């Protein structure tokens, strides 16, 4: 029956599927929309405590295929899903988009054939990904599956005969399995003839039908489930470069299940829910020993999060939905919309408080989001409380996240100065090899931190279409035997490749007590992508091919030191003079002189400078992408030149705030100028 | 003087630079063209022994910048190069292109300021890469450098004063370095005022000029060399997706030097010549100990070749040039030319001899290029002697290379069945951790072998623009703790991403005794890229979500076994029956039935089938890329449909040889059909 007497209807009773979901440690799939409403609601409470919300601020519409396989909206009792894949079209008004924003949600129904992927679920999953891609809408995937669906032609077990050699004795084996003329018959009546492929062969009595291939009448048993998974693997590969994609592992993901998680890139893993290719039982059978205890060893957060496969971990489903909603607040409503501006209590016009000290360790996060101190709060470069760090459990040499600058969304990459104690666990499978601690020195790229940088750059660019700033501060890549053997060169090159691809404005800024040297300057120079990149150096930063020590150890050897004394025992001191002699070359003053940076800057005035610089550029970019929808394009150069020709003569092309201000005051006026350019965009 | 009396002029004497190159273990840069002629000459000798060659079969033209910085051809004494970068435009008649083919050659002149990269060399290197990109011509780079150029303002050493605290005592230190009114003067006469940035400050006597920033009058000292390197890093990043790019490490490559090697991807390393980021000396200074003996430990072939950073190793320069020339024989003359067909003694029309045996180990290479045996030679699938394996020292679980099928160029990927004994050396830097042997089981993707597969797919597609065949035979990816911790998921996804990008025809073919299971089928299914991929399975191959054992261990548990006995102690035997029951599901007959493969095939007849299938498709593709240069394109579907509508009614669209034959007989006729389609490609 049902729990005798509760205040309201017993949900798990009305729809038993709900209880089955819960028993497996996951939210019932039809219950997730309520999770997004709750999260979307909290989102508002944290933005403007007062604002009174209404249920019509959030709308969830289930999507199902019609007579024609086309997606349409329906409202129905939860649990009517005929397949094991479910989808929702969600329209919600949020702080960044008060008038509303949409996105789709697809999820494995863990209660349908165990969340397995059959041909039907796969084509549905694919049909939804396209629905979203066509609309430029984000695709949120909720993974709670058991991998590809596995079958066997059950209607052949009961009726199938062997072909024993000894005619009546196991041991000697058999020569084939077959069907009598009786078997074939049932397969006739129950119209399942095509279940097998056989050859007629009367022998030692009467006609025997040798089975040459078992096919099965029931679909979803083998290779057809493999066609479907590859279909969505590629679908997901394509979507990632097309719309914002994100996956939340909610109970477990297996097979294409784990692959769908990675292919969509951005991932949030709920503690305790595994992402695996093969489970322990199976692996143990192979290995022959009881080497793996649970699946959490093969793919728990300790692996996938320390991995970088899982961008974030979540204590429970709702927390995972909260991360998604919060991540989405930095992303455009649909492909190619301007990035979602959201100004908050923290206004742009202010100095930056926290400042690093040449000698004294700090947390780069403090420079980004600010720091709380006994004597008040010290704001960092970005808006108070806007820093949303991601991939925080892997390659901690680099910190990456989204943040706001005067309300402007942008990807942020900073350098971790504190050494990292990466503790690499031991693998059971190997009788004996134990823990291993890898010391990762700060301000140095390693194979994993270089990979993370490339990854961050790509994730910022592909669905988020966000601008980016890199507080460049690396001494270079590690040249040790291990790091090279481990391909540090491949991962470094990934960075360059990613900067070439970047479609939004980029700011590279060497911070107050930081530096950029040979190995590291190369992979982040403005010329790698003149179209979008710009570089700025702090007045107190340093930059040169070699650090002073390396440089002195080559162009100020003792011989030259001595002749120096000669012109005016005393090594310790002079050795220092040489050091400082070099250091005088690595100043922003020289960078400015040599034309390698756009401007040298003062940290405490950076927030003011960058806010307007970025605002001005976002405005110019938008204009370029209008002359582009002309009919006879030309170089980015010809477009920016002609757009700047439209500026009033008195406007200083060099004043970011003026330019941004005049542009926002003439959006329509500028739009007219274009219209009457069209009739000149035919010939 | 010179070696007193030799038969002919002493080369190393006429141009001392030559001797300096040789002393450093490398070929003098102006001598490389002769290496390409020698190699190009050998190439002919191995193709058609008789053919009489003439010096005009090969032409080398040095390229230098003119008054306008534009590249032009010149003929001049070797050693006149004013910069440390040199380039050649090479036109050579080869077996695949008897009428001639071109390509450029750029090289660091190891004898010019030690092969350092100054702003001039960098802009020259970049100007040449573009020259090539614009022409769709291959770019061969010869790396023999010392990294970014390092300087110091030497004209400030002699004349610079300190500011001692004790007025006359090292220890107490100084407060700044400065120049007298005398210093400033010399800087005036020798017109090098801008060499420094100072502030006037009379003190305790008379005007002192505090140096706030040393700039230098001589260019090429610091950050400006960093701008240049990043410029070419990006230039090389772009070129790789645009033209065939290849690099030969000839003496050593440092800094952008190592990065240029990777960025261009394809690389051949001469034994003994290091590719490094930082040298040992420097690293030891940091670490404080004498941990690294030579540079070969940081980047010799044992690291870069076992790495996959170096595709091939070469015993000496000429051998490296031979590999380049041989690699280039599979690549088109310029971007978008049809792949270079080269038929040889081994005609297509023949059966394939070598065949694997279900139980008995073999070398997959034998299936590819054939095998030599006591009782004659047994041809494999591809042309005898056409298999050019690459990346052969890294991730040996996969074998990759170029080969010919009846003279047709194509990338080939096979699966190594024999277990691999990957011996991971110990790193010195770490007081104690020794060798480690990683056992890599066959027919299983691992992080490194999956990476190699993706890499191969990308390298085949980007400059080589080659078709490809994958003798798919993997049991799946490794699900162990280590392999997952090591991101096997990221590298697997790289494969999918690479198949999505493929622009030429693809053939996925499960070989005679091979298989494709769940973890592995997913990442290589035809739907990942319906436009170019096709899948075929051998009549003796197997495929299913799980191997029989895993499948029995789920849908044929004892309960069901027993009831089976019941319908007809005896476990060993029945257990087998269950196994075979499953195995009957994994047949090509079912794949064909379920519509997941294009055709099941017989190995010995494969060469005949694939040759024509590929030939037919190359012909159809070329036609699609003509309707494309229409004016109002549509789906690939609409184009192939209309092209097939042009075929004569009696032509069987399913007969590859007929179709290929009719198409080659009507190239011009088909070309007319298009012309008079143009007037219908306006409205």
From Swiss-Prot, chains A, B:
The gene is ACC1. Residues 7-343 form the CoA carboxyltransferase N-terminal domain. Carries out three functions: biotin carboxyl carrier protein, biotin carboxylase and carboxyltransferase. Involved in the synthesis of very-long-chain fatty acid synthesis which is required to maintain a functional nuclear envelope. Required for acylation and vacuolar membrane association of VAC8 which is necessary to maintain a normal morphology of the vacuole. CoA binds at residues 252, 555, 557. Changing residue 515 to Q: Does not affect catalytic activity. Residues 347-629 form the CoA carboxyltransferase C-terminal domain. Homodimer. Changing residue 252 to S: Raises KM for malonyl-CoA by a factor of 15. This is Acetyl-CoA carboxylase. It is found in: Cytoplasm; Endoplasmic reticulum membrane. It comes from the Eukaryota. It comes from Saccharomyces cerevisiae (strain ATCC 204508 / S288c) (Baker's yeast). Changing residue 475 to S: Raises KM for malonyl-CoA by a factor of 70. Present with 20200 molecules/cell in log phase SD medium. Acetyl-CoA binds at residues 148-150, 519. Induction: Repressed in presence of fatty acids. Repressed 3-fold by lipid precursors, inositol and choline, and also controlled by regulatory factors INO2, INO4 and OPI1.
């Amino acid at each position: 029956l049902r729990p005798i007497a509760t205040p309201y209807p017993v949900k798990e009773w009305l729809q038993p599927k709900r209880y089955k979901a819960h028993l497996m440690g996951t939210t019932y799939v039809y219950d997730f929309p309520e999770l997004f409403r709750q999260a979307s609601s909290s989102q508002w409470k944290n933005f403007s405590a007062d604002v009174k919300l209404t249920d019509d601020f959030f709308i969830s519409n289930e999507l199902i295929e019609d007579e024609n396989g086309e997606l349409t909206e329906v409202e129905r009792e939860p649990g009517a899903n005929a397949i094991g894949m479910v989808a929702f079209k969600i329209t919600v008004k949020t702080p960044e988009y008060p008038r509303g924003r949409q996105f789709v949600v697809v999820a494995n129904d863990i209660t349908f054939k165990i969340g397995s992927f059959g041909p039907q679920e796969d084509e549905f999953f694919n049909k939804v990904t396209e629905y979203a891609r066509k609309r430029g809408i984000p695709r949120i995937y909720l993974a709670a599956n058991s991998g590809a669906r596995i079958g066997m032609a059950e209607e052949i077990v009961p009726l199938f005969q062997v072909a024993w050699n000894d005619a009546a004795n196991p041991d000697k084996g058999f020569q084939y399995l077959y069907l009598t003329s009786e078997g074939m018959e049932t397969l006739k009546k129950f119209d399942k003839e095509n279940s097998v492929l056989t050859e007629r062969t009367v022998i030692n009595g009467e006609e025997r039908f040798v089975i040459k291939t078992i096919i099965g009448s029931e679909d979803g048993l083998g290779v057809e489930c493999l066609r479907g998974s590859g279909l969505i693997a590629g679908a997901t590969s394509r979507a990632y470069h097309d719309i914002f994609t994100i996956t939340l592992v909610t109970c477990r993901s297996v097979g294409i299940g784990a692959y769908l998680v990675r292919l969509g890139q951005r991932a949030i893993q709920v503690e305790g829910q595994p992402i695996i290719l093969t489970g322990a039982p199976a692996i143990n059978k192979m290995l022959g020993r009881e080497v793996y205890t649970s699946n959490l060893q093969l793919g728990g957060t300790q692996i996938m999060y320390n991995n970088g496969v899982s961008h974030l971990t979540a204590v429970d489903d709702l927390a995972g939905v909260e991360k998604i909603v919060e991540w989405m607040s930095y992303v455009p409503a649909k492909r190619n919309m301007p990035v979602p501006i959201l100004e908050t209590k923290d206004t742009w016009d202010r100095p930056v408080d926290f400042t690093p000290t040449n000698d004294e360790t700090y947390d780069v996060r403090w420079m980004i989001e600010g720091r709380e101190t006994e004597s008040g709060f010290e704001y960092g470069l970005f808006d108070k409380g806007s820093f949303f760090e991601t991939l925080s459990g892997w390659a901690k040499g680099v910190v990456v996240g989204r943040a706001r600058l005067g309300g402007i969304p942008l990807g942020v990459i900073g350098v971790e100065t504190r050494t990292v104690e990466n503790l690499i666990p031991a693998d059971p499978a190997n009788p004996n090899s134990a823990e291993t601690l890898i010391q990762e020195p700060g301000q140095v790229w390693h194979p994993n931190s270089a990979f993370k940088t490339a990854q961050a750059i790509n994730d910022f660019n592909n669905g988020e279409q966000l601008p980016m700033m890199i507080l460049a501060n690396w001494r270079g890549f590690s040249g040790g035997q291990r790091d090279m053997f481990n391909e540090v060169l491949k991962y470094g090159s990934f960075i360059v490749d990613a900067l070439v691809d970047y479609k939004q404005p980029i700011i590279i800024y060497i911070p107050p007590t930081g530096e950029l040297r040979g190995g590291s300057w190369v992979v982040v120079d403005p010329t790698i992508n003149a179209d979008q990149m710009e570089m700025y150096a702090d007045v107190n930063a340093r930059a040169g091919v070699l650090e002073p020590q390396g440089m002195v150890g080559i162009k100020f050897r003792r011989e030259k030191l001595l002749d120096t004394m000669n012109r005016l025992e005393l090594l310790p001191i002079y050795g220092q003079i040489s050091l400082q002699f070099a250091d005088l070359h690595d100043r922003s003053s020289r960078m400015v002189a040599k034309g390698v940076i756009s401007k040298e800057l003062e940290w405490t005035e950076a927030r003011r400078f960058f806010f307007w610089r970025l605002r001005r550029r976002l405005n110019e970019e938008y204009l370029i992408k209008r002359l582009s929808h002309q009919v006879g394009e030309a170089s980015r150069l010809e477009k920016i030149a002609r757009i700047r020709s439209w500026y009033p003569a008195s406007v200083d092309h060099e004043d970011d705030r003026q330019v941004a201000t005049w542009i926002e005051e003439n959006y329509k006026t500028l739009d007219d100028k274009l219209k009457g350019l069209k009739l000149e965009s035919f010939a």
